[PDB]
């Protein structure tokens, strides 16, 4: 009955809590106390990519670490040559309300999506000298939050339907649907091996998914409000979760537990984006106080602020080779930091 | 120096820059309006994924979106105004309407966005008030004390009870708006009948007021 199922669920939850507490022997601070501090990471602006006339909502980096796609709320995607500030393409969108970008790892495609319930894939390397729509991917009933490319003919999409999906661009079908959430999923971060991915929701929870099989493996609950940003450790064995309560947590997979807690007394604005570095020592967190704080991942101490923005940072990416980091803001200026 | 291909790439970038500038100079001259209101309210008959209705009055264009409001409301942070539609005829849904309005008013990202407030279906209000089958005082405890003020601007062709109830329903939203807003945005209430063709002039006039406010708040007049 309902009472029996409720009792069983409560017993299972208590058992899992006891198991996690049984493994809580030493925390990350206790060990990493004996590590030399980084010092002070002072990095300044090196390029200011201007041309957008509206808020910048998403940006992405190409695998080559020279091209970056950007989508703004005025209805245009722009592909940038970072080393030169030059613009390569300007895709005019059919709907002007975009909240996501996705650059294919091969570099042939870009994706967009937003309040129009549709993911549109654009073909870049084609003849006839025009970037055109490859295929429109209908099938959600809510705003598309994030879209990531597993490969050239696969894409993982999250929506405000409490649902994640996997598509075949060639065919147009949902190979699998990732049910299980209770609130609008707002972020997903692919694992480095591209066989797992975690997704965060407004119900203060993140679930680790298995792309092929299609089942939730672990469910992490330590936050108190929504999860805006999520990103894997480069190892693929940890992930940082940004939340509206100004706290970042470094979850761990083989222990199903929180390790570190990147929160400060004088910070109250929630996180907007979280990314790591190639070595996995720095944790760049984008806030609503108009600047980015660079934490030390293993010791929860600030190392510097990228204070050069006069509106919120809506997007933040680190190159696959670690040379630069790009912050995009609602002031309609990208900035490249090194 | 720079190779020939680099120069040609620069010229392509400049052509793209130019086209972006003309697109901006085109889109700048369209006012941009967000339409809310839950249901049983009459969104369809206000002005005769996202649905986008475009209309032009006095040579200025308007885009009036309605999404068919938790987390995507930050996208509409740069709109000129939010149109709110509340059905005054029904009385058991008015409290849900007030709560929705109070949510949208005190939202972090909407702290500088004004709200035109439409109170649809005034004919049904007159019918249910003159008929007397139901009583607003039954659902709403605080209608006994209220009396029609000395400035009952409504036309004489309306009974005192009709006007009194209409102004009470207006007050129940204006006291929400005029309580804690610090003067950064205001709410313009209007009354409608869903059979009125002169309904874009009101949006146009309120928008003129909104633009004037932000112009004299941007040019240090305040």
């Amino acid at each position, epitope marked *: 009955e309902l009472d029996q199922l409720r009792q069983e669920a409560e017993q299972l939850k208590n058992q899992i809590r006891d198991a996690r507490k049984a493994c809580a022997d030493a925390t990350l601070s206790q060990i990493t106390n004996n590590i030399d501090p980084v010092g002070r990471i002072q990095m300044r602006t090196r390029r200011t990519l201007r041309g957008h006339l509206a808020k910048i909502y998403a940006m992405h980096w190409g695998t080559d670490s*020279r*091209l970056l796609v950007s989508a703004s709320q005025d209805g245009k995607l722009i592909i940038w*040559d970072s080393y030169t500030t*030059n613009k*390569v*393409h300007a895709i005019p969108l059919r709907s002007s309300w975009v909240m996501t970008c996705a650059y294919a790892p091969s*570099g042939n495609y870009v994706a967009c999506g937003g309040l129009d319930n549709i993911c549109s894939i654009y073909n870049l*390397k084609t*003849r*006839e*000298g*025009n970037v055109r729509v490859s295929r429109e991917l209908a099938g959600h009933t809510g705003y598309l939050s994030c879209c990531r490319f597993l490969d050239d003919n696969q894409i993982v999409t999250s929506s405000g339907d409490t649902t994640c999906a996997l598509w075949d661009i060639e065919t147009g079908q949902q190979t699998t649907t990732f049910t299980g959430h209770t609130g609008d999923v707002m972020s997903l971060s692919l694992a480095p091996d591209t066989r797992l991915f975690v997704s965060g929701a407004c119900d203060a929870s993140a679930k680790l998914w298995d792309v092929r099989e299609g089942m939730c493996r672990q469910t992490f609950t330590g936050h108190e409000s929504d999860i805006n940003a999520i990103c894997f450790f480069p190892n693929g064995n940890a992930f940082a979760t940004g939340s509206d309560d100004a706290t970042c947590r470094l979850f761990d997979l083989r222990a199903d537990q929180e390790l570190m807690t990147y929160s400060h007394d004088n910070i109250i604005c929630g996180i907007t984006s979280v990314s790591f570095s190639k070595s996995g020592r720095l944790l760049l967190a984008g806030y609503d106080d108009f600047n980015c704080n660079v934490w030390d991942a293993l010791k929860a101490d600030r190392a510097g602020v990228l204070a050069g923005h006069d509106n919120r940072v809506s997007c933040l990416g680190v190159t696959d080779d670690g040379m630069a980091v790009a912050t995009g803001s609602w002031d309609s200026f990208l900035k490249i930091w090194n | 120096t720079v*190779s*020939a*291909e*680099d*120069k*040609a*790439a620069a*010229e*392509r970038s400049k*052509m793209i820059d130019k086209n972006l500038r003309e697109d901006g100079e085109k889109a700048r001259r369209t006012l941009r309006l967000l339409l809310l209101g839950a249901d049983n309210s009459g969104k369809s008959t206000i002005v005769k994924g996202i649905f986008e209705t475009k209309f032009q009055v006095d040579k200025v264009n308007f885009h009036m979106f309605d999404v068919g409001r938790r987390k995507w409301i930050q996208c509409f942070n740069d709109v000129t105004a939010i149109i709110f539609v509340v059905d005054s005829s029904d009385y058991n849904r008015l409290q849900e309407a007030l709560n929705d309005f109070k949510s949208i008013w005190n939202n972090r990202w909407l702290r500088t966005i004004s709200v035109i407030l439409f109170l649809n279906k005034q004919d049904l209000l007159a019918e249910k008030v003159l008929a007397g089958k139901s009583k607003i005082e039954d659902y709403f405890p605080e209608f006994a004390r209220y009396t029609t003020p000395e400035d009952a601007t409504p036309e004489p062709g309306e009974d005192p009870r009709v006007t009194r109830a209409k102004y009470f329903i207006r007050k129940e939203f204006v006291d929400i708006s005029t309580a804690s807003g610090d003067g950064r945005h205001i709410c313009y209430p209007h009354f409608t009948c869903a059979v009125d063709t002169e309904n874009a002039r009101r949006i146009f006039n309120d928008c003129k007021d909104i633009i004037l406010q932000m112009n004299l708040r941007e040019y240090n007049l305040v």
Partner: single-chain antibody
Amino acid sequence: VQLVESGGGLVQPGGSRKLSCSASGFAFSSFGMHWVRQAPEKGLEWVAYISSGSGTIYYADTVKGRFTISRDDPKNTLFLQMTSLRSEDTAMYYCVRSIYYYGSSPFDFWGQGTTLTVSSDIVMTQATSSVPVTPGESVSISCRSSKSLLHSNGNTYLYWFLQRPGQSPQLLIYRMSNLASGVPDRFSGSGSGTAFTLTISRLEAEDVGVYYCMQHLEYPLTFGAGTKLEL
């Protein structure tokens, strides 16, 4: 995609003509369009260039003050104007499209030709002016330059072309290492500054012709005399 050129015929010396290049199947206004002539006995020589938006115009030193290049973006047509024609202007005129950005492949499509009869630079020469070939074998072509083609930005601006018997030429290698779309993978390119090689693997039929190495560092664009591959 189809570039079709009309105009050109039998013309007395000192006259004037008009060359047309009709386009069909792409964003014409977004493409820079060249003109390349091949003498009835010689190889390929660059003539003019008109950019996207009619912005930048370049002419060869031998046709400056005598030719005019202009494009009609609405009707999608390229024009070359002849003034004070001389006997050295007899050739087959080719219309080429080229787009320039990161990842671009300039000189992708070449049009057909309009046989016209009139009744320092980086000069680089392919030493092998005539090479034999046997099917199923591997052949290497070489191209040595005058000044280095390695720019400061890590890019070697050298291009490899191929003209089959009686056809417009085709791009093989752009930027010394990158294969073009539609080219079989058996074509490979190598080389340093002022030394380049085009290695074919398993040289089969439909791969014989004349191979041209041009530079895209500085204007004028300069080709080589080519390299026949017979049997």
